[PDB]
Amino acid sequence: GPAVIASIAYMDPGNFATNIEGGARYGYSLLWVILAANLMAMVIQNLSANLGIASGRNLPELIRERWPRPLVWFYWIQAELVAMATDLAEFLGAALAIQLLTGLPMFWGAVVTGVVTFWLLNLQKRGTRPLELAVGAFVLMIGVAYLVQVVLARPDLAAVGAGFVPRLQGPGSAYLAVGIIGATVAPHVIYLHSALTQGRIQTDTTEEKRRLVRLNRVDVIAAMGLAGLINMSMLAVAAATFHGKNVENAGDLTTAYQTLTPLLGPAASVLFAVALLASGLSSSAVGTMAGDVIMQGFMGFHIPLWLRRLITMLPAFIVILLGMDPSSVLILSQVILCFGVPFALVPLLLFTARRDVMGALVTRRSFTVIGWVIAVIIIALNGYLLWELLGG
Ligand SMILES: CCCCCCCC/C=C/CCCCCCCC(=O)OC[C@H](O)CO
Ligand SMILES: CCCCCCCC/C=C/CCCCCCCC(=O)OC[C@H](O)CO
Ligand SMILES: CCCCCCCC/C=C\CCCCCCCC(=O)OC[C@H](O)CO
Ligand SMILES: CCCCCCCC/C=C\CCCCCCCC(=O)OC[C@H](O)CO
Ligand SMILES: CCCCCCCC/C=C\CCCCCCCC(=O)OC[C@H](O)CO
Ligand SMILES: CCCCCCCC/C=C\CCCCCCCC(=O)OC[C@H](O)CO
Ligand SMILES: CCCCCCCC/C=C\CCCCCCCC(=O)OC[C@H](O)CO
Ligand SMILES: CCCCCCCC/C=C\CCCCCCCC(=O)OC[C@H](O)CO
Ligand SMILES: CCCCCCCC/C=C\CCCCCCCC(=O)OC[C@H](O)CO
Ligand SMILES: [Cl-]
Ligand SMILES: [Cl-]
Ligand SMILES: [Mn+2]
Ligand SMILES: [Mn+2]
């Protein structure tokens, strides 16, 4: 199912870190963030998909051919920082799941992750098909587990209802709300989702274009709606499990399995870690593939795929060697990703409103306004958080 495959692709280790920590530390009060970020991602990914259908090119390619060279260089560098921050959460989340399963130190967990990710890149498309379905089964069923657990946990519905009213409770809640937006509105997909759509036309004609826009819109919203229900459920179960109970290391990903213990029993620790590992390995390989496509779109050339894989591993090993907490840096990476969202939105909103780019598929003037409002909101939230990190 198209809703199933995309919800699994969007459930990266960054979502696990932000949902568990969000519910455990702030209860249900951040449910409106997940709902809002999911609705924003619906509009943004629809524009990114409609850009590839109408133009036949991805967003990095259109920037390379239309904007002045120094601006293309700056946009390539910031998209490369998005690449490292995206891979940092996924590569480390897999290494963390290795520790949750085997007990190896985080350094060796990254070594095992590095060997698997290096080997996973050499595989062809026909060899990874059973693996893409395998990782999907693990992540999907864990998502359904939280959907069932959010009912069985009997959440305080008075607190659940109030959590959908936007309330930012200081700087700490703004830090985690920004991380949830970055974990939902993935800037790496903003550049990439155009490349998945480019060429999806069977044969060039306006009729086929409006057909694929119709199909993509239904599939994206259905998947996002499912991913949003799972994310809200995982945060709500984390709130019912830890919030207010003063549990040692609550919100951390090493104790997140306790959210599914009343449903899974002794299997909650293995099933959660296996899902965290599968979510980390698949998203780290896809992101590495996407980063290479993004560089070719911006610069017309790329570095060897093994070299890109080696460079993205360096921040993960350094964080491990520094003794930093894995769950905390996963959240930090999503916060940095949220600062890359407005940079990706500006060319997206500008290109999807041009006839020489979209042809007959120019975005409705209303949705262009909504897209700019989303950009101003995320800029304000990123500015609101970055303000209190300097004092205010
Ligand atoms: C591929 C799927 C199967 C997974 C197998 C990975 C394949 C590559 C393993 C390389 C060595 C990593 C194995 C662990 C490192 C060996 C040394 C070790 O175990 O060290 C433990 C000690 O506690 C530390 O001080
Ligand atoms: C917090 C902010 C609230 C967010 C509000 C949520 C609105 C729900 C929108 C869902 C998908 C929107 C799809 C928009 C598709 C626009 C396509 C268009 O305008 O036509 C162009 C042509 O069809 C091809 O490019
Ligand atoms: C935090 C976001 C990412 C941080 C990014 C920081 C670096 C910005 C990139 C290049 C410097 C400005 C462009 C100059 C280098 C591009 C070479 C070029 O094509 O143009 C040269 C000159 O600027 C023609 O006027
Ligand atoms: C299109 C049909 C209407 C959409 C159906 C939902 C009804 C609420 C309206 C918009 C949702 C977003 C706004 C809801 C949040 C209240 C307004 C707000 O943002 O302020 C926050 C809070 O009230 C400060 O204390
Ligand atoms: C491509 C990005 C565009 C570049 C443009 C701006 C870049 C700034 C990025 C991140 C600043 C935020 C750093 C967050 C560091 C906060 C450390 C922390 O742990 O915060 C704790 C929180 O206050 C309670 O838990
Ligand atoms: C068909 C295959 C289906 C079965 C496959 C999954 C079954 C998992 C079985 C044993 C869990 C091994 C872990 C030992 C018990 C863990 C329960 C627990 O309390 O967790 C402690 C935690 O590891 C401390 O941090
Ligand atoms: C991160 C700072 C710079 C890191 C860079 C130094 C690390 C090199 C060490 C081991 C990798 C060696 C991999 C060898 C792969 C062989 C592929 C080859 O033949 O190289 C030609 C070209 O790279 C493609 O065709
Ligand atoms: C704190 C609140 C934010 C503070 C920071 C302010 C940033 C505001 C960003 C966008 C405003 C609306 C911009 C709408 C631009 C529309 C441009 C357009 O439609 O086409 C013109 C294009 O430049 C032809 O090449
Ligand atoms: C890198 C991606 C993000 C770019 C980062 C841009 C940072 C600065 C932009 C906007 C400032 C944020 C404005 C926050 C809104 C609060 C300011 C305000 O209006 O104060 C309220 C009232 O005036 C007092 O009583
Ligand atoms: Cl242009
Ligand atoms: Cl409460
Ligand atoms: Mn994500
Ligand atoms: Mn930890």
Numbering used by the authors: 45 to 436
Could you give the paper's own sentences about this structure?
Transporters of the Nramp (Natural resistance-associated macrophage protein) family import divalent transition metal ions into cells of most organisms. In addition to the physiological substrates Fe2+ and Mn2+, Nramps can also transport toxic metals like Cd2+ and Hg2+ but exclude the abundant alkaline earth metals like Mg2+ and Ca2+. Recent bacterial Nramp structures reveal a LeuT fold, three stable conformations (outward-open, occluded, and inward-open), and identify the metal-binding site residues, including conserved aspartate, asparagine, and methionine residues. We present high-resolution structures of DraNramp in three conformations in both Mn2+-bound and metal-free states, providing the first molecular map of the entire Mn2+ transport cycle.
